[PDB]
Amino acid sequence: VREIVHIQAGQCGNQIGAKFWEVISDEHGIDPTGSYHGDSDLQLERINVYYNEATGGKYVPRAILVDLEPGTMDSVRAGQFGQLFRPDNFVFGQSGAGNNWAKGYYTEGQELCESILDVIRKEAESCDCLQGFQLVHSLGGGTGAGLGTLLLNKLREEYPDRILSTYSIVPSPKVSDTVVEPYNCTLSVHQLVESADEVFCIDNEALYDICFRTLKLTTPTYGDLNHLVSMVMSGTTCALRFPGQLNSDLRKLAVNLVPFPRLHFFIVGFAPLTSRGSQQYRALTVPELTSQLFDNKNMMAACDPRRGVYLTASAHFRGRMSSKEVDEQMLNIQARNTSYFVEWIPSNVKSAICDIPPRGLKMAATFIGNTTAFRELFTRVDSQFQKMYARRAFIHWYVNEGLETVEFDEARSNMTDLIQEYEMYET
Template sequence: VYFNEASGGRFVPRAVLMDLEPGTMDSVRSGPYGQIFRPDNFVFGQSGAGNNWAKGHYTEGAELIDSVLDVVRKEAENCDCLQGFQVCHSLGGGTGSGMGTLLISKIREEYPDRMMLTFSVFPSPKVSDTVVEPYNGTVSVHQLVENADECMVLDNEALYDICFRTLKLATPTFGDLNHLISATMSGVTCCLRFPGQLNSDLRKLAVNLIPFPRLHFFMVGFAPLTSRGSQQYRALTVPELTQQMWDAKNMMAAS
């Protein structure tokens, strides 16, 4: 269950949003979905991590982590039967990589028997903001190997390729990339949110997908992907859909 029911039939996401600078939080708050989140669940610092993993993990992030854990604890205590945690972060910057992995390790200490699923946006050389992305990514992967149970690998290069080649978008925005990621996340968590026989919880998903405990990095494919203009003219058959699903062009991580 991803939502709590509030008064008046409103549903509030069981989400904790954290960052080391207030700017992104303000844009979420003022955006179209800002009102659905609990105001107490926005936790942010003032200084930012400056694309520095150590700042996120050891200095700025370490100062904020207790406030984040308090909010996580409150959400966990409201659960009848806590199954696990789902973390969305990027590994290229300082906050998502440094503080993200710090949060994962702290949650692992506090809830050792709960599942940890991450959606991690890995850095890629073709779509790069900063020169230190490879360092941030490398030190974060070590933490993910040790402390995460399932890790969905995403990267912007593959997402841009999908936007250009498959969706035929001339100038993809981050909104388009986020739409792809949200469709993928929705597909992956579908088995947790609706009744079914296979992979009905995070643990069963891990049992069926992971051959060795440390080998838990998954490449996610999504189908059907068609450009907006051609959707009405296509009727996919089962073999075509299966073919698309395993096609490298439909993978959310560049191989």
């Protein structure tokens, strides 16, 4: 009884979350209409963690979808699992997103939040227990950034004990979709540092690189990218739904991986990924998974770990394997590459083994890592934000909404302080 509430915002968040619900529904074996036609009894043991039961043999997910513009939910309702979500869980206004963080935070954010908090409260107290909330939002845009930060602050005000684990996409440095993206990223970082406990960030250019390097996807759409984020989502919480040889929930991961209150930003990775044509050459074993997991080329974040050092790390495993083999590999990978690990924290690698593998993949593992390579991601946006801030250009647009120009300086100062904190902890 560790129910987790799922929240979506923006076009990017809603589409990713929609793909997430497809994967988790298929994992348990639930028909698109909400009725069970699965294959195993172990699927029903802890289905309460993500679903509510509507009397009649129908399951309604603990999901809330929010967008400022109504365009996105038209595709969601037309989707395969559109009918699954509660009709009263669709909360939205009738104004354009505007791609503006200040507009999304002060103009439409205030009006929408008063409607949203009641739906969240109705979903939160519907279950006996609630370990924490789960959020998917976009930092680059206006709706997902501003609304996500405002809702995170409000949830922290109301539910201090619960773990607010969030997933976000950091704007790509080279070819991104927004001119004014550095403004939104810089403003969102300030609230995101102080509010959320567990944070994971994905770079889209890394997704294109990973998809083309490994899976040989000739025509990579957004579906496969959203699909990859789904396995990262599914492998994160696998322990709560099913048993295993070593249990680890979100609170265990947060205590183990977070050494200080301001160092909690994480990067993620998933394994195994194999080419669909040459997948029948791989005798996948635990050493092979460890090589794929710890490889820099399979990281969903555009930051090379070799350029920095690690602080804490953790690996979650799925399937039936030996515990000694995981421990021996874990010791070997720590001893061989000591150049990238701090000397004052021994045994920086934490393990967790669930028992049931996911569909389609005889055995699987997931990796979450924390490192000082985060400075490069903050370096790119800092330089871009300084260039944007030099000639006062787009300050004009944000002024008409109510935002003060000093807020940029406070946000950049806070993010620069985080850069310094990562720098001095490298020693």
